[PDB]
Design a protein around this nucleic acid. Sequence first.
RNA 1: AUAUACCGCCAUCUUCAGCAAACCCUGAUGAAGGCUACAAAGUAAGCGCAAGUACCCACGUAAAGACGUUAGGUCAAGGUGUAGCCC
Lengths: 63, 338, 103, 132, 220
Amino acid sequence: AGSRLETVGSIFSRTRDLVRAGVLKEKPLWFDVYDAFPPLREPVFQRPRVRYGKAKAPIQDIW
Amino acid sequence: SFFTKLTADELWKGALAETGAGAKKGRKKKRKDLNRGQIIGEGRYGFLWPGLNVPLMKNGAVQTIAQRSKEEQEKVEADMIQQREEWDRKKKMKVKRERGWSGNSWGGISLGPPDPGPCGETYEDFDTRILEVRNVFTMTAKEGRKKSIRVLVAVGNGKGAAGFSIGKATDRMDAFRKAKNRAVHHLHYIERYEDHTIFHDISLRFKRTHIKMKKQPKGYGLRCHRAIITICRLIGIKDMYAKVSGSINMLSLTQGLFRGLSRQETHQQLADKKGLHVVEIREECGPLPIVVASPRGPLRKDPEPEDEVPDVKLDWEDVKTAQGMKRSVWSNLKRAAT
Amino acid sequence: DEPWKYLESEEYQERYGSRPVWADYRRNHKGGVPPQRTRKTCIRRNKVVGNPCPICRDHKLHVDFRNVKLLEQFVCAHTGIIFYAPYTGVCVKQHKRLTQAIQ
Amino acid sequence: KNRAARVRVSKGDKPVTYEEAHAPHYIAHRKGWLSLHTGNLDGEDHAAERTVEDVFLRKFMWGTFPGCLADQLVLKRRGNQLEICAVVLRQLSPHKYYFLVGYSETLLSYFYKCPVRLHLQTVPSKVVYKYL
Amino acid sequence: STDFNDKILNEPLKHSDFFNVKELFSVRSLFDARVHLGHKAGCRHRFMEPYIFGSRLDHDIIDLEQTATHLQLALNFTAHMAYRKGIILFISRNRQFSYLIENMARDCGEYAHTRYFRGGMLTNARLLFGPTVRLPDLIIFLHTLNNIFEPHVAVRDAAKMNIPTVGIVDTNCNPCLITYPVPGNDDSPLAVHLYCRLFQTAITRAKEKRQQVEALYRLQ
RNA sequence: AUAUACCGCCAUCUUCAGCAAACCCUGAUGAAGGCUACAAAGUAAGCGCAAGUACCCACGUAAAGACGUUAGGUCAAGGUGUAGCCC
Ligand SMILES: [Mg+2]
Ligand SMILES: [Mg+2]
Ligand SMILES: [Zn+2]
């Protein structure tokens, strides 16, 4: 079946790679929709890090 | 007497002593079936019963009770003894296994394809290889020192899709089954350049294990750590160099190898990222420029910076080898085909 | 008389397949690093030693300069260099015969 | 612990029939007696003779049909008639089954001086009630 | 069947907005439903910074301009999945809205799971339900956080099982593993009701359009 | 001769409720860990308890009572491994 490594790439990347490698016999129902209308950001896992130095959140105040 | 007789199974259970004080905690004989070579209607008197041990009809006529001659019965006994001896020899001999990295090691030993999936899924294209078999003990009050087996298993279809898993079990075969059935659900897809090698050199440090992989041309072979050789065979990589430094922990080595291989950047991705043709220069092909990658989107007309000096963190071993100062008596040793 | 006929034969295909004749050979040696030289010869005084090399273990394989299909298995297709003896496991005698036949 | 006529669960892999899966304290409750004769009733005699005959019949049919009996025999006595009902596998050829039926019936009838009959019910394999 | 499979399945993928979901909502409607309201600046999660318009008196405000595009993409994806007769599973551990969400699912012919999420409903579904069970083809989170403010385990499980997930992410949520995140308020009753109505309308429109297309092809 | 080779039949905690395969998840896929009901990763077939059954009820008494523990008892119920005796 599909790879369960949620922290490696996205679901689309893993599914496409497995289909190309022939592990997945048939593409899932959602694959064509994702290919046609991908989201703005690929859902790649990312570990959040807290800022430590001069870097600060760019969220400007509303005035 | 007769009523004191028992069944074969009960007698074997009593004689083999599979359970008891000695076998309870480990504070040689084996079962042999006596019915495999015995035919109904055969006795020491050598009688021929029509319909049970001999054909009911001979020459289209009903057979009668017949008794084999003494010489014929001797021949039958000799045939029975010969069959028993041949079966005993066949059972004693075995098809010798293919040893792994060493005769008594479990690494490199193939386990066959993983068990088929329930929903019509088969993994006959996948090969399973053992990488480490450790006996792990724990201190429990109830049982003293509890023993278990942890097995590291790598699987792969030889076409990029490969994975690894860890199986904990009280029984070694159960650990193998668990690990090899869990690995196929954790399959990385490793991109291979020209379906034989990695796309570029990979320098990684997973925990305390440094892995340095060098892309190599066709026919260079796998000059890598034996575990990396096995994993690359599972992936489908045929030419690569790999040096392991620091801790050589097998689990960390496998995890770092898979991390680096999965995180490698393909030529097409580089071309799309920087919007420039990725052109290959080969010494054997002379000055011919081979455009191995081209950007999907619009091409970048920026002639790119002609960096006079590249600020790249070199490795001292590579520079020493290139300059010839390295004189290790173990490098470039002739070895069997990998 | 016709060594290439063996490689054209069905028995060779069944025994070896598309793999080279040395694919399944594995030297038995001490340690993890094999000795840098193979055995001098697998046939000593017309007697065959244990674990003979791929050439010696199959009497129908003749190292003859006309047996080009067999000699191709001992030359790297990508670089054209003849594999050294430890690479394929052939003994020194058969390796010298292979080199002379290839030349 | 009670070790009498019980199958101990080890890995949930051992197949057991309905008879083996039930401990003795279930005889009156879930598995009737494998033999049915009036000897053990009140005021009836020859219980020991019937018991000895039943034991001999079981040990004789077990060896006459080696590896064929799927489960334990069922012995019924009606007057002087004796009926052995046996669940048998389909491994052996029907010719051998009929030969054994005739041989066993005649030999038992002449040995015990009673009209013995043998009814065989064939099953493809040993019926598994549960796994232990 | 190719003349059927192609014409019904592939044709809607040729249109930028086949189901015309962009008419179902507007930035004014989201503003009225208090979609733009977020948590305190202290509770802000790092990955939600790009979707935050700004902070108004230490209160984060969600950029409805990005919310419009994200919601358009999510509604289009949900409508396409429903049109393909996929299984849609709404998930929200917010008790206050639980009942309502369930009703919406029961009204849209889809499935809901608002109660406690037992360990392994997705990664062990072959054993919990059966070897032939069909996992959902799309999961919609009305709330991406459990009752202890950690991300819902269903997000990670669906990412493991390669199930695309639409999700309403507040300022303190983690949109990293969500396939189609919609930055919006998940606490106001108006916002949750608007999301439920929008997804219900998208799914119903998709199902009725699928019925219309199938009937039209049969009449061809 | 050996219960310190066993089957067989049992003692004992047991006047116990735990034993658990098979999966899933967490720890970077380290020896490990998996508890929250206004619930936060566990599910569990099966075994035992329970249930059901016997006796006079639904109560009670029996029966039942797993995995383990004492190298627990029995080679003298019987069978059997090993070893020994055969004027
Ligand atoms: Mg050895
Ligand atoms: Mg919120
Ligand atoms: Zn030789």
